[PDB]
Write a protein that binds this ligand. Sequence first.
Ligand SMILES: [Zn+2]
Ligand SMILES: [Zn+2]
Lengths: 369, 369
Amino acid sequence: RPRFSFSIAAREGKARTGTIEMKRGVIRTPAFMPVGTAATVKALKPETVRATGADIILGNTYHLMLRPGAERIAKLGGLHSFMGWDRPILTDSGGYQVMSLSSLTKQSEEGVTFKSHRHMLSPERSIEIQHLLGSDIVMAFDECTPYPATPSRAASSMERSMRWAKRSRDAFDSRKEQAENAALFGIQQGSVFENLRQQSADALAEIGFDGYAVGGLAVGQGQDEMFRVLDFSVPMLPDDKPHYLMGVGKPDDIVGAVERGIDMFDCVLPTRSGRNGQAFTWDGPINIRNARFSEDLKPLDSECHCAVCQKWSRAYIHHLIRAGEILGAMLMTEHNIAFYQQLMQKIRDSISEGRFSQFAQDFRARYFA
Amino acid sequence: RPRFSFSIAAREGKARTGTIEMKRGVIRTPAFMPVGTAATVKALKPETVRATGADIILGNTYHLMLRPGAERIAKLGGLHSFMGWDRPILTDSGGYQVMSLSSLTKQSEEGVTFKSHRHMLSPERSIEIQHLLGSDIVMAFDECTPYPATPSRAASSMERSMRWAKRSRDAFDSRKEQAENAALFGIQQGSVFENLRQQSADALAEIGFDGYAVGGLAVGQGQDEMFRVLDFSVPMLPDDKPHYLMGVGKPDDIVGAVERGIDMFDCVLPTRSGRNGQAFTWDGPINIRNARFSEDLKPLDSECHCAVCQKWSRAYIHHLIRAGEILGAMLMTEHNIAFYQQLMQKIRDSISEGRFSQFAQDFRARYFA
Ligand SMILES: [Zn+2]
Ligand SMILES: [Zn+2]
């Protein structure tokens, strides 16, 4: 396989289905990426993650740089060998978690220094760490914009992010091993403002990336607003490259995002919320801790083909989660990630068949009945 | 298969190797039983437990009667269907955990009432609950003796336990479905006193059981004392039935116990201590949390054939346990239970081959080097 090749096989409206070919494997799009925080998809062996249908996972640079350390991981052979996942890995830049989880941060035009929940990140250091991890898809380092944000603040942070985009581009390309074997994505910013989103798209396209993320839309916007901004933002991005909506999300958010041209997703909802008792079903989510499930012999979802739904009852998983048993987390997580992968499979097949609009309508009518 | 058939295929000294045939499967002896507390072997799917070589697991009646409830489990189809383990299950009587974990207990000749950490247990109720769970090997309900114990106290509790042994026998036999499909073991008591151990053995043999446990030797005795008491106690039991040492234990305890005629073991050490960072190896245990493992690419044990040692490094498991990641518990637990099963396999093969004395010497010289 090539370093990177995105091909669109079928379209319906703004929706697309296709493949990203990379050295470590093929990624089917639209794609959902299970989140591996600190070198693990919580409560699952990598073989189990693969068994659910995942083609690629996300790694959180911030957490990995703190524990176990980027240089240590490189010394040990890289993230893939360390955790036992040999397919593509997308790593974030670490910039978001600096702002949401670290302390005493100090931001400047060079980058950010911060205290672990003393460290540094910058466009150059972030791209370097992703290299040390052995990332297949590298994310440009940027500066987040909170929501809401004033237009001045949104513009300042977008502008800085585009300067850092160019710095990220240059750092990646100067490292031949990285440039020849990994891909680099740029992140569109601009908060909810169309003019700023357009300026950002133009700046990224001018620099040129392998794929384009829509950043900053999972920091408090509700769905209507997120979709409104996707409506004008995604068409601004190059059509022939992947479109990655960072941090999204709920099944209905995914469906609508794909209707608006998004090709890639990541979210901790299936893993986190599964540990917390929330199970996804085609009839909407349930909280397995509810007493109504204590003697329910049915599987978590009546149609789900995952191993969990083949072998255990709601009653059993209810018991495990109530008792705080690790197997409960394991089974909830496997199911939810398998659900999410079946959703993406239904989305891909329906776009391939020119029936995605119908699928989205049917999905919604039942999920929200 | 029959309800119950124990056959001895080979002997060396007091050691024995053979099989217990039961309706749900064959148990190879000497046997190690992973402990399933509240309907789970912590951090492992039942298929994984089986993959390590386990032929049978233990279920803790006390915990199950509290959560999710014995009657509920029966309504749901029994413990095997509930948790997804279809091979034999041995259930304890719940009496030990009443004494070590419950409060405000009230003991009498009829049984014990107690508060959950309000409930009751008695010979009749304990055998009933084991029935409701669908247990294959049922343990008689008795009264524990602390260590140390005075001879008067030891004798009183032993005597009561033998009265309760007869009550347990009668309750089991009166329930035809249970009597025809499960087995009943009696428990020898007597603290560390030879005369009391002999009286207890005689009383149990007179009543007649399918197998005979040595109780009360994992409550503070060190190894020398435990072995001293096994030296005279195990020969008192019927030779042609299984000998179950409850609550033991460490690898060297198992080896020495088998040298003294024990056929079955259970302990929470491999599972519990694995969650806590202790990994068993042929060169003795290690604590994976120690900084010396942070960049150790070797597997947990150099010879272990488990899946964990095939795929992950010490460095990785060190990271997971330090980070409190569930996968760390999962991998440590799988390894330790696989270690324990490989130990039992080496013990069985060496007895079959008439070289167990040599095996015990070699084992020790390396495990304690
Ligand atoms: Zn499922
Ligand atoms: Zn191993």
